């Protein structure tokens with residue numbers, strides 16, 4: 418840090434090596450079911466005395482009993498989310514599990530909330546999507562639906578053209594904010610490797626733009642000797658160049674949902690808040706569902 422000067426002292430976004438602090442991340446080796454990497458906050462987040470090197474079986478609570486049914490790997494059910502209790506004092510979490518191509522089993526834990534009961538909201542949302550008669554109507558209904566379901570201060574459909582340039586194609590926002598409707602932005606604002614990642618990982622939640630990243634410990638995977646592939650991690654810390662851009666805009670929190678059409682990133686539903694904001698698993702899942710439905714309608718509309 419300060420003690421190293423002289424000449425030698427002078428981005429792959431999926432290899433962040435760190436998470437956002439609203440969750441905890443465990444990496445488990447499946448030969449022994451022991452934690453081989455964890456976010457540095459994990460023991461305090463989960464109210465455990467220790468975490469790194471611990472067998473899942475010995476972790477206070479029921480995480481192991483809750484994940485066992487999903488571990489047999491042929492069952493091609495992952496990624497999957499489980500609800501469990503961990504820690505002393507005990508807390509309910511939702512645990513999102515997936516396997517990176519190498520490096521073990523990742524378990525990302527957020528504090529659990531209640532059941533969200535939006536099925537009566539969702540029936541008519543689905544009818545508006547399925548009957549929209551043009552892309553203009555579809556995307557205008559999309560921003561309204563998402564704003565209603567998520568409550569973010571601004572919701573946009575950010576559409577990509579053939580050269581990758583961004584267009585704010587639809588927008589809705591709370592009274593008195595600035596409108597970005599119809600603004601165009603260069604393709605460089607969403608780099609190609611981000612777009613590929615957003616084809617894999619269809620929802621991103623940035624809770625607080627100002628957060629301090631929480632590093633994984635150890636940083637390198639003990640299984641691979643490389644950084645952990647965090648492409649599938651919903652807690653992944655986001656590129657600092659992006660976080661600066663958001664700070665420059667005065668945005669505090671974001672939710673983005675991919676629109677994938679014919680296997681390409683067609684656009685994004687992009688939501689901004691002016692205070693920190695988190696949407697829990699059950700709501701993210703509904704967002705994902707809506708985005709699949711929208712992409713189906715876009716495919717039909719385009720011919």
Ligand SMILES: C=CC1=C(C)/C(=C/c2[nH]c(/C=C3N=C(/C=C4\NC(=O)[C@H](C)[C@H]4C=C)C(C)=C\3CCC(=O)O)c(CCC(=O)O)c2C)NC1=O
Pocket residue numbers: 430575583585597602605606607608611615621622623654655656657658659662671672673685687
């Ligand atoms: C209304 C205006 C608006 C713009 C222009 C905007 C750009 C944008 N950049 C990104 C992502 C990234 N941008 C950049 C890079 C830059 N951006 C710049 O302005 C610089 C020239 C350039 C270096 C700072 C990078 C690396 C990402 C990936 C973020 C990540 O997923 O970690 C996303 C996806 C957000 C998400 O999925 O959470 C969007 C939507 N997001 C917006 O809401």
Ligand SMILES: [Cl-]
Pocket residue numbers: 445446447448520521522
């Ligand atoms: Cl393993």
Ligand SMILES: [Cl-]
Pocket residue numbers: 550551552553718
């Ligand atoms: Cl159309």
Ligand SMILES: [Cl-]
Pocket residue numbers: 553
């Ligand atoms: Cl139009």
Ligand SMILES: [Cl-]
Pocket residue numbers: 692
């Ligand atoms: Cl404030």
